[PDB]
Design a protein around this motif. Structure first.
Motif, mmCIF file in Angstrom:
data_model
loop_
_atom_site.group_PDB
_atom_site.id
_atom_site.type_symbol
_atom_site.label_atom_id
_atom_site.label_comp_id
_atom_site.label_asym_id
_atom_site.label_seq_id
_atom_site.Cartn_x
_atom_site.Cartn_y
_atom_site.Cartn_z
ATOM 1 N N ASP A 24 -5.946 7.199 -5.334
ATOM 2 C CA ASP A 24 -4.674 7.640 -5.654
ATOM 3 C C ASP A 24 -3.679 7.595 -4.582
ATOM 4 O O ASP A 24 -3.652 8.640 -3.889
ATOM 5 C CB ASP A 24 -4.745 8.978 -6.465
ATOM 6 N N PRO A 25 -2.698 6.858 -4.618
ATOM 7 C CA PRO A 25 -1.725 6.972 -3.401
ATOM 8 C C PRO A 25 -1.126 8.266 -3.358
ATOM 9 O O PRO A 25 -0.534 8.585 -2.148
ATOM 10 C CB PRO A 25 -0.832 5.862 -3.855
ATOM 11 N N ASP A 26 -0.778 8.690 -4.399
ATOM 12 C CA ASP A 26 -0.049 9.891 -4.662
ATOM 13 C C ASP A 26 -0.671 10.984 -3.711
ATOM 14 O O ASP A 26 -0.275 11.780 -3.283
ATOM 15 C CB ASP A 26 0.322 10.411 -5.866
ATOM 16 N N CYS A 27 -1.937 11.105 -3.714
ATOM 17 C CA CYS A 27 -2.659 11.617 -2.586
ATOM 18 C C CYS A 27 -2.449 11.171 -1.077
ATOM 19 O O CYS A 27 -2.352 11.765 -0.262
ATOM 20 C CB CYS A 27 -4.071 11.489 -2.877
ATOM 21 N N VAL A 28 -2.548 9.662 -0.869
ATOM 22 C CA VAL A 28 -2.551 9.079 0.122
ATOM 23 C C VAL A 28 -1.281 9.424 1.210
ATOM 24 O O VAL A 28 -1.423 9.489 2.386
ATOM 25 C CB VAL A 28 -2.750 7.437 0.152
ATOM 26 N N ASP A 29 -0.075 9.356 0.838
ATOM 27 C CA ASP A 29 1.167 9.637 1.494
ATOM 28 C C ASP A 29 1.107 11.009 1.811
ATOM 29 O O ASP A 29 0.975 11.199 3.018
ATOM 30 C CB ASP A 29 2.297 9.111 0.713
ATOM 31 N N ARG A 30 1.040 12.063 0.925
ATOM 32 C CA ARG A 30 0.949 13.400 1.133
ATOM 33 C C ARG A 30 0.373 13.622 2.215
ATOM 34 O O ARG A 30 1.112 14.297 3.183
ATOM 35 C CB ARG A 30 0.309 13.984 -0.129
ATOM 36 N N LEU A 31 -0.792 13.254 2.577
ATOM 37 C CA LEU A 31 -1.774 13.468 3.427
ATOM 38 C C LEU A 31 -0.981 13.072 4.862
ATOM 39 O O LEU A 31 -0.803 13.649 5.823
ATOM 40 C CB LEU A 31 -3.099 13.025 3.386
ATOM 41 N N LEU A 32 -0.766 11.557 4.879
ATOM 42 C CA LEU A 32 -0.302 11.156 6.197
ATOM 43 C C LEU A 32 1.008 11.320 6.458
ATOM 44 O O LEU A 32 1.111 11.817 7.675
ATOM 45 C CB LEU A 32 -0.518 9.453 6.010
ATOM 46 N N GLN A 33 1.995 11.350 5.601
ATOM 47 C CA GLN A 33 3.139 11.879 5.760
ATOM 48 C C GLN A 33 3.247 13.344 6.392
ATOM 49 O O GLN A 33 3.822 13.826 7.303
ATOM 50 C CB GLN A 33 4.171 11.772 4.488
ATOM 51 N N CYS A 34 2.358 14.021 5.742
ATOM 52 C CA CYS A 34 2.296 15.541 6.050
ATOM 53 C C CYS A 34 1.713 15.661 7.543
ATOM 54 O O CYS A 34 2.216 16.123 8.556
ATOM 55 C CB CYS A 34 1.444 16.346 5.376
ATOM 56 N N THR A 35 0.216 15.144 7.748
ATOM 57 C CA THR A 35 -0.188 15.214 9.062
ATOM 58 C C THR A 35 0.612 14.723 10.356
ATOM 59 O O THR A 35 0.728 15.180 11.440
ATOM 60 C CB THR A 35 -1.551 14.216 8.988
ATOM 61 N N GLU A 68 -3.700 3.104 10.905
ATOM 62 C CA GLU A 68 -2.965 4.396 10.988
ATOM 63 C C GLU A 68 -3.601 5.764 10.652
ATOM 64 O O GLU A 68 -3.123 6.656 11.396
ATOM 65 C CB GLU A 68 -1.793 4.162 9.820
ATOM 66 N N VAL A 69 -4.591 5.840 9.801
ATOM 67 C CA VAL A 69 -5.297 7.040 9.730
ATOM 68 C C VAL A 69 -6.010 7.221 11.208
ATOM 69 O O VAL A 69 -6.343 8.315 11.328
ATOM 70 C CB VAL A 69 -6.405 7.030 8.479
ATOM 71 N N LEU A 70 -6.735 6.530 11.469
ATOM 72 C CA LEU A 70 -7.285 6.568 12.942
ATOM 73 C C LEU A 70 -6.506 6.880 14.018
ATOM 74 O O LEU A 70 -6.754 7.723 14.666
ATOM 75 C CB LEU A 70 -8.272 5.143 13.193
ATOM 76 N N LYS A 71 -5.336 6.163 14.165
ATOM 77 C CA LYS A 71 -4.419 6.519 15.210
ATOM 78 C C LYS A 71 -4.194 8.160 14.985
ATOM 79 O O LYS A 71 -4.399 8.808 15.990
ATOM 80 C CB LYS A 71 -2.979 5.720 15.095
ATOM 81 N N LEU A 72 -3.864 8.636 13.566
ATOM 82 C CA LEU A 72 -3.503 10.078 13.586
ATOM 83 C C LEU A 72 -4.661 10.866 14.195
ATOM 84 O O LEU A 72 -4.511 11.855 14.782
ATOM 85 C CB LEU A 72 -3.385 10.262 12.238
ATOM 86 N N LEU A 73 -5.938 10.571 13.817
ATOM 87 C CA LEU A 73 -7.132 11.292 14.015
ATOM 88 C C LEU A 73 -7.319 11.450 15.510
ATOM 89 O O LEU A 73 -7.398 12.486 16.050
ATOM 90 C CB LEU A 73 -8.187 10.668 13.391
#
Length: 425
Positions: free
Chosen positions: A230-241, A282-287
């Protein structure tokens, strides 16, 4: 009604110098001006504000007359009237005036827009809290369009104010009010609100940045479980982080975000969106970025374990190698492993399965580094800026960074420092 007569009464009020209050009759004629035609209203728009301060017994009629002109159908009449509103914002009128100006931000005429912004700035300097009260009532209680415009005003305009105006108490009020707004912001508003607050001078300290991090953590909702589909989860997280990342430093930690990514996100690679960017990276870059600010982590071992496991899926056995993924993962493992060099030693036998993957991977490093350096030599300082040679240059940082990280894992070390390839020194 007539320009000749408005001029004459202007003259009267002006020549009277210190005696102006002795001519309430003339100012009345000026207020009557708003009933006139175009040229007459254009005059009233200048003359009403000019002498306003002299006539207490007429104040109410003065503002209302001016506000009629502020909603005139002729936009140039509105522009002239709007430019002078700060003059009415005396005594107890400023909050009512702040309210009107905020509503007026929704104009689509660009010149009116500029004038509305300037007037908010003027009254802001007269009474910062009163102006903020106006801006924030509209954000919390007005129309969407006005709510959007007001947020943009704060987002782009606070920076143009002298520090003198932006006192500790004004900044406290900005925080308090934004915290009410943040109970219900889209992701795009969240971004604006983070820029607004991270710009406050009292929020640039260690404690200030800590509180900001906690707002992002509250916004991202970390005690929620995680859903990959569910993307609606996916943005929230990355945009937030993403908003938190600039906030971290040696004294301000990423701990909760790091844990959350390890336990909830890694195992849930790889579900992706479109387009045409690579999401898992992108997730990995963040981490990787947050990993070097990790604090005292209870689940250190369990997360370090899950990090390790993820790595091995990109470091095969004796195949196309995913260097960019491995940069992030090795870096993160490097950063977290430092706290627990007991890992690798203590846990298991599978560490010999690891040395082979390293050996193997490293062999692919030399090969790839060779190809990159060969494709790049002889090239001019100008040919390097091709979007093709840019990628190749970045690839040299990627691959050379991995080589250094592998090296260190020789007793294994964590002394070395690399600059992530997509970051500056």
């Amino acid at each position: 009604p007539t320009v000749e007569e408005l001029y004459r009464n202007y003259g009267i009020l002006a020549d009277a110098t210190e005696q102006v209050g002795q001519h309430k009759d003339a100012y009345q004629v000026i207020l009557d001006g708003v009933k006139g035609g175009t040229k007459e209203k254009r005059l009233a728009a200048q003359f009403i504000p000019k002498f306003f301060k002299h006539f207490p017994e007429l104040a109410d009629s003065a503002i209302n007359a001016q506000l009629d002109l502020c909603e005139d159908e002729d936009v140039s009449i509105r522009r002239q009237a709007i430019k002078e509103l700060p003059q009415f914002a005396t005594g107890e009128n400023l909050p009512r005036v702040a309210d009107i100006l905020t509503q007026l931000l929704q104009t689509d005429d660009s010149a009116e827009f500029n004038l509305v912004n300037n007037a908010l700035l003027s009254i802001f300097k007269m009474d910062a809290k009163g102006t903020l009260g106006g801006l924030f009532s509209q954000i919390l209680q007005g129309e969407d369009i006005v709510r959007e415009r007001a947020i943009k005003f704060l987002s782009t305009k606070l920076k143009t104010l002298p520090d003198e105006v932006l006192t500790k108490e004004v900044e406290e009020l900005i925080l308090t009010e934004s915290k009410k707004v943040l109970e219900d912001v889209t992701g795009e508003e969240f971004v604006l609100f983070m820029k607004i607050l991270s710009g406050l001078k009292s929020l640039q300290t260690v404690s200030g940045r800590q509180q900001l991090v906690e707002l992002v953590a509250e916004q991202a909702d970390l005690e929620q479980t995680f859903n990959p589909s569910d993307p609606d989860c996916v943005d929230r997280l990355l945009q937030c982080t993403r908003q938190a990342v600039p906030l971290f430093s040696k004294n301000v930690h990423s701990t909760r975000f790091v844990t959350y990514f390890c336990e909830q996100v890694l195992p849930n690679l790889g579900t992706l969106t479109t387009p045409g960017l690579d999401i898992q990276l992108e997730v990995l870059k963040l981490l990787a970025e947050m990993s070097s600010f990790c604090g005292d982590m209870e689940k250190l071992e369990t997360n370090l374990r899950k990090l390790f496991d993820k790595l091995l899926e990109y470091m095969p056995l004796p195949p196309k190698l995913q260097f960019s993924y491995v940069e992030c993962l090795l870096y993160s493992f490097h950063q977290l492993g430092r706290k627990l060099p007991d890992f690798l030693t203590a846990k298991a036998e599978k560490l010999k399965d690891f040395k082979i993957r390293l050996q193997y991977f490293a062999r692919g490093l030399q090969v790839y580094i060779r190809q990159l350096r060969l494709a790049l030599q002889g090239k001019t300082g100008e040919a390097l800026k091709t979007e093709e040679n840019k990628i190749k240059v970045v690839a040299l940082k990627i691959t050379n960074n991995i080589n250094v990280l592998i090296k260190d894992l020789f007793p294994p070390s964590y002394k070395s420092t690399v600059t992530l390839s997509w970051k500056p020194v």
